Design a protein around this nucleic acid. Structure first.
Lengths: 20, 46, 93, 99, 63, 77
RNA sequence: UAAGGUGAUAUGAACCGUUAUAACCGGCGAUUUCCGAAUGGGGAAACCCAGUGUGUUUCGACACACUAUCAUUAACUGAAUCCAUAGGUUAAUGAGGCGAACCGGGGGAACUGAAACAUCUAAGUACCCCGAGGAAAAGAAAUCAACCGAGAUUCCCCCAGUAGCGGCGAGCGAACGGGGAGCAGCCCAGAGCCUGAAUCAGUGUGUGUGUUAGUGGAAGCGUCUGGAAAGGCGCGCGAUACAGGGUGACAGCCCCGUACACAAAAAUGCACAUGCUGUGAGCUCGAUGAGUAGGGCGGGACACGUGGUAUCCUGUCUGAAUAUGGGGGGACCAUCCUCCAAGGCUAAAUACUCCUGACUGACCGAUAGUGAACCAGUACCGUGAGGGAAAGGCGAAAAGAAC
RNA sequence: AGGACCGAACCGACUAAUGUUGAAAAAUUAGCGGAUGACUUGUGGCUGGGGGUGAAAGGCCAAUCAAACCGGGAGAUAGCU
RNA sequence: CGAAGGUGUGCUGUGAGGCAUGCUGGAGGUAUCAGAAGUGCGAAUGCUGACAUAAGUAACGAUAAAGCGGGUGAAAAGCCCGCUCGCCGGAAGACCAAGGGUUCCUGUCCAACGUUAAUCGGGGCAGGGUGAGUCGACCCCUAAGGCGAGGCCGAAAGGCGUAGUCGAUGGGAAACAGGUUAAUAUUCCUGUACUUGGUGUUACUGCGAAGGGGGGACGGAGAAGGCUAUGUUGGCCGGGCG
RNA sequence: UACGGUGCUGAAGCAACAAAUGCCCUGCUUCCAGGAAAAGCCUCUAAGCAUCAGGUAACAUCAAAUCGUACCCCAAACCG
């Protein structure tokens, strides 16, 4: 009955802005 | 690919050492902190 | 004395448990749990005085334990030394 | 402490019933015999612990559920120990028996 | 024992104590340590007697 | 260090204040010069690093009197 | 202190002791590996190596002690250079480092506020460092007052958001005086006179009281419901104790305690007893702190930003008098009043709380409270510095469910 | 002989494709370039944040970089949501 | 002779809600009036924790294919054994560093853990196991560099650095090959040595330094020769004739 | 033999040829960029020592400690 669970915070962005 | 963490006990010990943080006021305050803070893994060295 | 009874205190217990020390008991030599104290010479002078088994070298070897019991806090054994006594002519007596 | 004892026991189920008090235990328990009775389910296992039966085992009862037998009375009338003979010597206080 | 040891003179206790330890505790400490007789109670004492001998004599300053 | 050794003046500190009043720490250091004074009562040189208010004191109070001091006061003769 | 134990998860085995030297608890002592200020040298924290003595020695080897550095002192030697220092060696002392906070000194912001923002503010805070003590520092007027007088310092509440300062913006913000808390003054800069004489200090040794062990310490039964009574009902009793907790449901009289009354081998806190040790007093007459105070220059501290701006601190350059004299009383002079710096020390009142004990709480009750009631500064996460959880409860009793 | 040529190792990343809640917080496959040097890499060592380093891009300095990270000022401040 | 809370209903009040009560529950809770609050929650991409949802969907980690027959076991596509088949082979093999830190081997057990099944395993639980004069690290010696007595600087902290002393990745004395453990191995054993040091015995003799000199002691590229590991072939020997 | 395998025994065991990036060779040649150090080693003396002691050689004899060493090691034990 061990437990280990973290939280994640890293980006899912890769896509670039529209119409600058 | 080449990652961050490549260990080397030789370097760790002689760049994050107990006996390498033992000679300056500031590298003394460090010890002081993790002991009255109770933190007791130290430098992680045998 | 040639050296203190402090170092005639090293032997605390016999280890001859199982193979390679049963194999090597039948074949030759004895083996015995020796402290942790770290020498050869005071050990060589130990199995002589204490006992009277004749020896000629000692082989010394740290026994570094392994992780063990409880998932409620994972533990590891205290270390010691095993020494192969290395009987000279003591294997007959 | 005033209890190696002639009790009659305060608690019900046990109320006028007697026994020796074998040993006084550290955790505020004692052993009274014939009246702490539990029906301990002995499990049988090798190299002793051989019989398989729901055995009876005097468990251990509290030490404030004891009340003390007296010679002339079933009840207790409390114990003073205060008489000096070179140590505390007991007595049921309020007739100071020397017991 | 306690006072037994306490009334013994310096020179005495010195040769007694090699004995206590070795070959009056040594014999126990090996046998027991491999199980031959589980007279386990014997270690506790002796140890706590070989302590005594080393307390005294030194602490008596050679008396 | 930058002590007079006659009176031992440490550098005071304080703010500049400009013709539009702009404070900024800047350090007021004594003068300090190594001068070889002549004991004449041991007849040797006692090069001491001393200021130039300091020097005036040594001449006015007398050689073997500041040399009395310093040694009595805990800093190197 | 005591009839029962062998700390805990955790049982159990073997045994020990049974009121009188077990076992339990305290004082004192001993031991206190190795690392760590760590210190014989070295070093990747918990390791490696060595010198010199005192030995032992079965002649093989193996112990034990000392050996750091720095400050001071003493002795010994002793260059360049006769000399002498300088230096070096040695020895005897004392120090070093670790702490949470408070305190004094040294150093010292920025965000922010000013609706921006630079003077100002934040704040001389935070923070770093150094130093020390149980309090610290400060302190026996070159302090005020106002034509009367007051008389060391400190701290509290005022005075009073006054007076005043102020990109007169924001804001900062006293004192004088008043009431209290709490109160002791003294040396040296020198000759005496008597010559431990007060007085402290440190050594004694004791007397008292306190603490660190603890001990004793009161008075209820019947009955009904109930798994169980400590609840209900009925009849009693103790009270310098009805504080609390525990015991099978809510117990003054069931138990541990409790007030109260006792109790110390020793070791120490506190008063006082008095020896010694050192300290220096008490009367005469002298003394009254120069590279200083002022002053020029530049800053800082004063509520006060140089502004009309004293005064105090002082880095720079000068540079005065010597009690028929000097300082100050907020530009400055005069007068008048009042005081004697540049030598030094000092209790208390007051601040603070890591830690210790005892108690208490309209504080919490397990997403709370500390992060943390449970093997928590842990597990984990990070190279590190560091960051940093979850997870409490069967039951009255393990009787933890034989078969 | 050669910062020579062709090209494994080794290093590096020019194209495309596949991936792109992946097999993987930058890789894989087929091609590609360099290749005894201004090479490349192991071991160890050295530069510190207003600073380094930089055949130079504001790149890189622990998956973070036009001023790292961590603690603290600090519950900064936010007329803003 | 059944509190709170939970969970249902009736009644009731303008409402917030209250009251009565059945079931659950096994103990505490509190009229009234007044006093105080961490005093009322649906929303903060709130926070923590629980459990959904997409869904039994996606995927199941290489296009280096496995197949059979036994064995055990309750259960075999995957495991063990055996026989084929395929794959790598300057590695997907072997030795070793770094790093890890028992993951090794043996015996047992399958909840959880392997992205399945699981009799299996680097899992759990027991046990066992790492052996050196010569190997390597300590060690001797130093390198870049570091720390640094004295010292000079610097408010302090500290900074630098001399004499020193550390610091490998270099240099320094020396063991090889069989045989052997369930698992070790240049270490144990066996065979055959070598190295250095101490002491002593003997002989002989000018020995002696934080000292002097020499020697240690060295680049890149290229170019052969000489040589051997080793390989190929034949010979030899053994076995074989489909 | 238990069917995991263990013991008992043992023939031949040569030659030629090809070789390596390995060794001789940290050499040699050559080239311009001009290519560690210290100690051990050997040797000379200084202060010093004097039938000594030390040095050198042999022989006899003894000592040579402590840790790592398992296993993985292009990986399923390392890093992600």
């Amino acid at each position: 009955a061990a437990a280990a669970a973290a939280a994640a915070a890293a980006a899912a962005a890769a896509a670039a802005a529209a119409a600058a | 690919m080449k990652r961050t963490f490549q260990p080397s006990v030789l370097k760790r010990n002689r760049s994050h050492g107990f006996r390498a943080r033992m000679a300056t006021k500031n590298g003394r305050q460090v010890l002081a902190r993790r002991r009255a803070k109770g933190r007791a893994r130290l430098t992680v060295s045998k | 004395m040639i050296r203190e009874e402090r170092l005639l205190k090293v032997l605390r217990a016999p280890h001859v448990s199982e193979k390679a020390s049963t194999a090597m008991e039948k074949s030759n030599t004895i083996v015995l749990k020796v402290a942790k104290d770290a020498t050869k010479a005071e050990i060589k002078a130990a199995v002589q005085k204490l006992f009277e088994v004749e020896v000629e070298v000692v082989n010394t070897l740290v026994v570094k334990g392994k992780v063990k019991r409880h998932g409620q806090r994972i533990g590891r054994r205290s270390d010691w030394k095993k020494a192969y006594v290395t009987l000279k002519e003591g294997q007959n007596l | 402490a005033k209890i190696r004892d002639e009790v009659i026991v305060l608690t019900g189920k046990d109320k006028g019933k007697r026994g020796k008090v074998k040993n006084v235990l550290s955790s505020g328990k004692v052993i009274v015999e014939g009246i702490n009775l539990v029906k301990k389910h002995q499990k049988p296992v090798p190299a002793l612990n051989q019989p398989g039966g729901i055995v009876e085992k005097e468990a251990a009862i509290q030490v404030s559920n004891v009340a003390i037998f007296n010679a002339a009375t079933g009840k207790a009338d409390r114990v003073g120990f205060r008489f000096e003979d070179g140590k505390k010597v007991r007595f049921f206080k309020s007739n100071s028996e020397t017991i | 024992m306690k006072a037994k040891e306490l009334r013994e003179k310096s020179v005495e206790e010195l040769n007694t104590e090699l004995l206590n330890l070795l070959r009056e505790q040594f014999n126990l400490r090996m046998q027991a340590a491999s199980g031959q007789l589980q007279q386990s109670h014997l270690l506790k004492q002796v140890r706590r007697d070989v302590a005594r001998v080393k307390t005294l004599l030194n602490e008596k300053a050679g008396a | 260090s930058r002590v007079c050794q006659v009176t031992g003046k440490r550098p005071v500190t304080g703010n500049n204040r400009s013709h539009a009043l702009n404070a900024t720490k800047r350090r007021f250091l004594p003068n300090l010069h190594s001068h070889r004074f002549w004991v004449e009562s041991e007849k040797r040189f006692v090069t001491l690093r001393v200021s130039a208010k300091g020097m005036r004191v040594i001449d006015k109070k007398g050689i073997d009197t500041v040399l009395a001091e310093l040694r009595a006061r805990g800093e190197k003769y």
